[PDB]
Write an enzyme that holds these catalytic residues in place. Structure first.
Site, short mmCIF file in Angstrom:
data_model
loop_
_atom_site.label_atom_id
_atom_site.label_comp_id
_atom_site.label_asym_id
_atom_site.label_seq_id
_atom_site.Cartn_x
_atom_site.Cartn_y
_atom_site.Cartn_z
N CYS A 139 34.65 -10.29 -11.99
CA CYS A 139 35.53 -10.32 -13.16
C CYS A 139 34.82 -9.72 -14.37
CB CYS A 139 36.01 -11.75 -13.46
SG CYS A 139 37.40 -11.92 -14.70
N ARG A 179 35.09 -11.86 -18.34
CA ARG A 179 34.53 -13.20 -18.50
C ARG A 179 34.08 -13.50 -19.93
NH1 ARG A 179 30.06 -13.49 -13.84
NH2 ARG A 179 30.33 -11.22 -13.80
N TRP A 224 45.20 -11.36 -18.52
CA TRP A 224 45.98 -10.17 -18.84
C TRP A 224 45.30 -8.97 -18.19
CZ3 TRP A 224 43.98 -13.20 -22.95
CH2 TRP A 224 42.75 -12.77 -23.47
N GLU A 229 43.65 -1.23 -13.84
CA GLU A 229 44.17 -1.93 -12.67
C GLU A 229 45.56 -1.43 -12.32
OE1 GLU A 229 43.33 -6.31 -12.35
OE2 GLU A 229 42.99 -6.16 -14.52
C1 HEM Z 1 41.86 -12.69 -19.48
C2 HEM Z 1 41.59 -11.42 -19.19
C3 HEM Z 1 41.08 -10.98 -17.80
C4 HEM Z 1 40.73 -9.73 -17.51
C5 HEM Z 1 40.77 -8.55 -18.52
C6 HEM Z 1 40.30 -9.67 -16.13
C7 HEM Z 1 39.86 -8.55 -15.45
C8 HEM Z 1 39.53 -8.51 -14.11
C9 HEM Z 1 39.45 -7.34 -13.27
C10 HEM Z 1 39.74 -5.90 -13.74
C11 HEM Z 1 39.10 -7.72 -12.03
C12 HEM Z 1 38.91 -6.77 -10.83
C13 HEM Z 1 39.86 -7.17 -9.71
C14 HEM Z 1 40.59 -5.97 -9.16
O1 HEM Z 1 40.09 -4.82 -9.31
O2 HEM Z 1 41.67 -6.16 -8.55
C15 HEM Z 1 38.94 -9.16 -12.05
C16 HEM Z 1 38.57 -9.97 -11.01
C17 HEM Z 1 38.63 -11.35 -10.95
N1 HEM Z 1 38.98 -12.20 -11.97
FE1 HEM Z 1 39.43 -11.60 -13.89
N2 HEM Z 1 40.41 -10.95 -15.61
C18 HEM Z 1 40.89 -11.79 -16.59
C19 HEM Z 1 41.14 -13.15 -16.43
C20 HEM Z 1 40.73 -13.96 -15.38
C21 HEM Z 1 40.93 -15.39 -15.28
C22 HEM Z 1 41.65 -16.23 -16.36
C23 HEM Z 1 40.40 -15.81 -14.11
C24 HEM Z 1 40.31 -17.22 -13.49
C25 HEM Z 1 40.46 -18.34 -14.21
C26 HEM Z 1 39.84 -14.65 -13.44
C27 HEM Z 1 39.19 -14.63 -12.23
C28 HEM Z 1 38.91 -13.50 -11.50
C29 HEM Z 1 38.50 -13.44 -10.11
C30 HEM Z 1 38.28 -14.64 -9.16
C31 HEM Z 1 38.33 -12.16 -9.79
C32 HEM Z 1 37.89 -11.64 -8.41
C33 HEM Z 1 39.15 -11.11 -7.75
C34 HEM Z 1 38.83 -10.86 -6.31
O3 HEM Z 1 37.63 -10.86 -5.94
O4 HEM Z 1 39.79 -10.68 -5.53
N3 HEM Z 1 40.07 -13.55 -14.24
N4 HEM Z 1 39.20 -9.60 -13.33
C1 LIG Z 2 43.42 -13.12 -13.38
C2 LIG Z 2 43.24 -11.64 -13.18
C3 LIG Z 2 43.30 -10.80 -14.28
C4 LIG Z 2 43.14 -9.44 -14.11
N1 LIG Z 2 43.19 -8.60 -15.17
N2 LIG Z 2 42.93 -8.95 -12.87
C5 LIG Z 2 42.87 -9.73 -11.76
C6 LIG Z 2 42.63 -9.02 -10.44
C7 LIG Z 2 42.71 -9.81 -9.13
C8 LIG Z 2 42.82 -8.88 -7.92
C9 LIG Z 2 41.91 -8.97 -6.85
C10 LIG Z 2 42.02 -8.11 -5.75
C11 LIG Z 2 41.05 -8.19 -4.58
C12 LIG Z 2 41.67 -8.66 -3.26
C13 LIG Z 2 42.95 -9.47 -3.47
N3 LIG Z 2 43.15 -10.52 -2.46
C14 LIG Z 2 44.58 -10.55 -2.12
C15 LIG Z 2 42.37 -10.28 -1.23
C16 LIG Z 2 43.02 -7.16 -5.72
F1 LIG Z 2 43.13 -6.33 -4.66
C17 LIG Z 2 43.92 -7.07 -6.76
F2 LIG Z 2 44.90 -6.14 -6.72
C18 LIG Z 2 43.82 -7.92 -7.86
F3 LIG Z 2 44.72 -7.77 -8.85
C19 LIG Z 2 43.02 -11.10 -11.90
CL LIG Z 3 47.39 -5.87 -9.72
#
Ligand code: HEM
Ligand SMILES: Cc1cc(N)nc(CCc2cc(CCCN(C)C)c(F)c(F)c2F)c1
Ligand SMILES: [Cl-]
Ligand code: HEM
Ligand SMILES: Cc1cc(N)nc(CCc2cc(CCCN(C)C)c(F)c(F)c2F)c1
Ligand SMILES: C[C@H](O)[C@H](O)[C@H]1CNc2nc(N)[nH]c(=O)c2N1
Ligand SMILES: C[C@H](O)[C@H](O)[C@H]1CNc2nc(N)[nH]c(=O)c2N1
Ligand SMILES: [Cl-]
Ligand SMILES: [Gd]
Ligand SMILES: [Gd]
Ligand SMILES: [Zn+2]
Lengths: 401, 402
Positions: free
Chosen positions: A105, A108, A277, A282
């Site tokens: 993430c 953070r 958000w 993404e």
């Molecule tokens: C508030 C603004 C936030 C932004 C800008 C943000 C941004 C991102 C981005 C760009 C990713 C990459 C995942 C992908 O490429 O699909 C990610 C991953 C992740 N975020 Fe955040 N996020 C936010 C909020 C949160 C919150 C509120 C949580 C949990 C309470 C969270 C938990 C996670 C987790 C667990 C991942 C790993 C996803 C995975 O491994 O599948 N995020 N985040």
């Molecule tokens: C709270 C939050 C905010 C933000 N800004 N972004 C995310 C991104 C999470 C995410 C994680 C993955 C990894 C694998 C997904 N699981 C089903 C295996 C994706 F592929 C994906 F598209 C995707 F949005 C989460």
């Molecule tokens: Cl998405």
């Protein structure tokens, strides 16, 4: 203690927090598996003990009064019942820590500002839906998005789990064809045919919002239609490319992950959707331009009159930048919170600096922190990073079917 | 139990069985992954040697033959009598190609079989070293039709110092420390620039001043050699539609020739073995020109493009970088100097992975170095899980000789 260098500035730090790494990762001295998406009972008391110690450390309250008191109660609870209940403040503390610990993430810097809805007394899929509807309403907030997690009852032996079968609360349908091709989102073809199997009258559109499949313990899922006014979406337009709107593209406001397992102090919550958000890449880079997703890149290039006959024209790179422009422009015009990858990575560098002084390091997954476009134009590219697992954590879990 | 590896664009799954042979150890553990870090006895010489001899005889379909055991015995006997051994000429060619093939951070490895190997293991002096290097530059450059090559100088051996090239590449632009603490020219080359001056070089004061060579023969101070100007092919940078871009006065050189790495073959170490191929355009257009700690031209170009540089959400950085990379591709094509864009190079690397899966059961690859620094997920390698590990023969980092 691994030495870590930033190559833009030349500064050096040491990640001493890595010394506390919990469950093992996939790498060995003989081979690195860092680029892989999925890395290949009195134990409950060791995890709960450590989490309780974590909690009282943060509030500057280790080693007195309520610290040992809470230590005896969890022991007695597990002795008499086999599991335990988190206090609401601990549940709040654990949810924020799991976000703080998420190596992938980039957002953070926000980890301390998180609204936790306590749904541990949920009893049916009907109640789930109302909870999920409350979350979406709160988090969306007419476009001024607010970070939120809703925590459903924890896993317990003998009974089935609460599960959200969708990977996100808002997803677009993926409709197969006579010829294998897909109308809509190819990432959701599987859950689309599940929803249709459980009675959902499908649509014919490229951006039909799917229904929810919600599963109470020991019962098959139940389809729920999301209230159309609760799903905030943004039609995509470009600030100067007048024809971009005619492509009919859209994306939704709220990224809410609904298929991950939340683990706190040895307790497991297989239903705990969280939302923040979007970072604009993404949507504009991965969701819209990945070859296995909407794969719109060449259609945009054609509209831009680019030379798609040679890779060295960089037509792909040009079309991608304008798609990302359209995303940022459209969301700002809609007054819906979004952050560009430059702003997000600069704030992550600030977060790393904060975590260095607060905890002695920060678990970070370089391949996921560096954005999918313009990597070396962001500061995180030039920052060496250490990846490791800490608890509390968000964990991947098998699909419930 | 071999690592399963997925391609997410296509859905393909393979198993990297080659990884089970990794001859050395990397920096990661089950506790923590350090993949993103830039920098990660006769009996043991013999077992390295024996493994390489086994590789070579496998490649020529002579595994377990009379000649195979004969060579094993020859090497055992030379290590016992001298502490080391000498490669046959055909073993050196095979070993140099294998080192390139094994390099996890090289996206250009579809070319690995086409490598011209110059045997300079008879080199006697730094003056002879300079002549070998000049001929390497001449052969490799080939008037802009670039050819991959390596020149192999004498091995490390008991009794003698090393041959070393102090320059990190054969062609490099000076970096002049100044007094704002600023740098005129290439900031990556401030250290070597200061050493050249300290060793008698009269510095220039331009931004693209080609550095002299500092060449070190065994047990001698380094010796300074100027490159003959007509051997150094350069490309002035222009843009196909932004006519003011030429007035930036930017240039880059044709030949990327890494000269400070150590080549290891069967336990023998070659501290001097410069190698060269041809550029991928992002190396120049994104890293060398746009890194904040390199020429750092991004903002100046964006200002000239009339982009809005007071808000990140205008994506001015992305737009200026795309046009800089266009300028590089256009200018090298205009000059008839070989160059490959990041889309074609990553496409060819995917075919290399497929070739290698059939040939060896896998391929060592460093995802962070293989994915280009712009447009990462627009290339196929982004979506390909990779397994990183160390095979020998190998190119290795080594400390600077000063
Ligand atoms: C508030 C603004 C936030 C932004 C800008 C943000 C941004 C991102 C981005 C760009 C990713 C990459 C995942 C992908 O490429 O699909 C990610 C991953 C992740 N975020 Fe955040 N996020 C936010 C909020 C949160 C919150 C509120 C949580 C949990 C309470 C969270 C938990 C996670 C987790 C667990 C991942 C790993 C996803 C995975 O491994 O599948 N995020 N985040
Ligand atoms: C709270 C939050 C905010 C933000 N800004 N972004 C995310 C991104 C999470 C995410 C994680 C993955 C990894 C694998 C997904 N699981 C089903 C295996 C994706 F592929 C994906 F598209 C995707 F949005 C989460
Ligand atoms: Cl998405
Ligand atoms: C012929 C065309 C070639 C192309 C297009 C190419 C491309 C690349 C690129 C883009 C990198 C990343 C390095 C960076 O970003 O600075 C790299 C690294 C590397 N390449 Fe290649 N290369 C080619 C030829 C060769 C040859 C001929 C050799 C050796 C005989 C070689 C060995 C290496 C090594 C050892 C590295 C790692 C360098 C390091 O880690 O410092 N390459 N290559
Ligand atoms: C034959 C070749 C062809 C090509 N197309 N590209 C390269 C690029 C190698 C390289 C590697 C590094 C890694 C750091 C190690 N150095 C500091 C000792 C650089 F920094 C660098 F500038 C650099 F050009 C080499
Ligand atoms: C194969 C590769 O690991 C995979 O495409 C990863 C790379 N980095 C990523 N980074 C983010 N943020 N999201 C992703 O889905 C991926 N995918
Ligand atoms: C710190 C980080 O590992 C560093 O910037 C790396 C990342 N990936 C790279 N990839 C390539 N091809 N070349 C590089 O110099 C780097 N640098
Ligand atoms: Cl270079
Ligand atoms: Gd038109
Ligand atoms: Gd023009
Ligand atoms: Zn690793």
């Amino acid at each position: 203690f691994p030495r870590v260098k930033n190559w833009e500035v030349g500064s050096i730090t040491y990640d001493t927090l890595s010394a506390q790494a919990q469950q093992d990762g996939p790498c060995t001295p003989r081979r690195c598996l860092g680029s892989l998406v999925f890395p290949r009972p009195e134990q409950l008391l060791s995890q709960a003990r450590d989490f309780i110690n974590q909690y009282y450390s943060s509030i500057k309250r280790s080693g007195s009064q309520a610290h040992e008191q809470r230590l005896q109660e969890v022991e007695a609870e597990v002795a008499a019942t086999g599991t335990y209940q988190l206090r609401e403040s601990e549940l709040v503390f654990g949810a924020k820590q799991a976000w703080r610990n998420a190596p992938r993430c980039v957002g953070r810097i926000q980890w301390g500002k998180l609204q936790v809805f306590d749904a541990r007394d949920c009893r049916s899929a009907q109640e789930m839906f109302t909870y999920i509807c409350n979350h979406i309403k709160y988090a969306t907030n007419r476009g001024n998005l607010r970070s939120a997690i809703t925590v459903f009852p924890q896993r317990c032996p003998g009974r089935g789990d609460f599960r959200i079968w969708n990977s996100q609360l808002v997803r677009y349908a993926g409709y197969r064809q006579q010829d294998g091709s897909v109308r809509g989102d190819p990432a959701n073809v599987e859950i689309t045919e599940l929803c249709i199997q459980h009675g959902w009258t499908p649509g014919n559109g490229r951006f039909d919002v799917l229904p929810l499949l919600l599963q109470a313990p020991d019962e098959p899922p139940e389809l729920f239609l999301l209230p159309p006014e609760l799903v905030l979406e943004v039609p995509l337009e470009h600030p100067t490319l007048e024809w971009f709107a005619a492509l009919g593209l859209r994306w939704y406001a709220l990224p809410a992950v609904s298929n991950m397992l939340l683990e706190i102090g040895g307790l497991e919550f297989p239903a705990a959707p969280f939302s923040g958000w979007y970072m604009s890449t993404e949507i504009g880079t991965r969701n819209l331009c990945d070859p296995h997703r909407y794969n719109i890149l060449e259609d945009v290039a054609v509209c831009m009159d680019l030379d798609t006959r040679t890779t060295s024209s960089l037509w792909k790179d040009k079309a991608a930048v304008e798609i990302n422009v359209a995303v940022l422009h459209s969301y700002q015009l809609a007054k819906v919170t979004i952050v560009d990858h430059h702003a997000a990575t600069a704030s992550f560098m600030k977060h790393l600096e904060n975590e260095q002084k607060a905890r002695g390091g920060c678990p970070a997954d370089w391949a996921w922190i560096v954005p999918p476009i313009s990597g070396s134009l962001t500061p995180v590219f030039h920052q060496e990073m250490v990846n490791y697992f800490l608890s509390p954590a968000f964990r991947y879990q098998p699909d419930p079917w």
